Write a protein that binds this ligand. Structure first.
Ligand SMILES: Cn1c(C(=O)O)c(NC(=O)c2ccc(NC(=O)NC3CC3)cc2)c2cccnc21
Length: 164
């Protein structure tokens, strides 16, 4: 059901798309959220995915944190995908704007290997402060399963594809 994606490697594909609209169209088995350790979905991809679930993702996340405590930077948890997907894999990449170690980005992408196919954003990009070209390079060199990347900004998408 994924269509209009450029092929980067044997297993990594990319599209200039709104990940919420892409999830509603495809209804994948797994959509990846670019989460923080507290699962507080305020801005960026996290806020957009939560808003499309009418806040059901945040209510479910708050119960998960109340039971288990916060995630590790580089870690993940599988929760419901609500109206967007069967499941949502909440992955925490390092937030470079908070002094988190960039080496944890490879650990964050290793979580994708537990799932055969994923619709995902670039981790640690945007408001997390890491270089998006570096995030795409770590993705290609780490993920072995089929990943379909959705990049919202047209100019960033063109730069990622021309510099790859
Ligand atoms: C790299 N990046 C990305 C990205 O998705 O590539 C961000 N992504 C976003 O802000 C983002 C915002 C909105 C949506 N869609 C909807 O809300 N769609 C429903 C109305 C119909 C998806 C995503 C980002 C926000 C800060 C900084 N960098 C960002």
């Amino acid at each position: 059901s994924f269509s209009g994606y450029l092929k980067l490697t044997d297993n990594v594909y990319i599209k200039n798309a709104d990940i919420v609209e892409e999830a509603k169209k495809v209804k994948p088995t797994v959509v990846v959220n670019a989460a923080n350790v507290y699962l507080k979905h305020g801005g960026g991809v996290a806020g957009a995915l939560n808003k499309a679930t009418n806040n059901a993702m945040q209510v479910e996340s708050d119960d998960y944190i109340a039971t288990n405590g916060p995630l590790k930077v580089g870690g993940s948890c599988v929760l419901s995908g609500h109206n967007l997907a069967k499941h949502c894999l909440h992955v925490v990449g390092p937030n470079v704007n908070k002094g988190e170690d960039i080496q944890l980005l490879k650990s964050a992408y290793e979580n994708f290997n537990q799932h055969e196919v994923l619709l995902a954003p670039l981790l640690s990009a945007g408001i997390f402060g890491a270089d998006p070209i570096h995030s795409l390079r770590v993705c290609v060199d780490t993920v072995r399963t089929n990943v379909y990347l959705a990049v919202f900004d047209k100019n960033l998408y063109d730069k990622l594809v021309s510099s790859f």
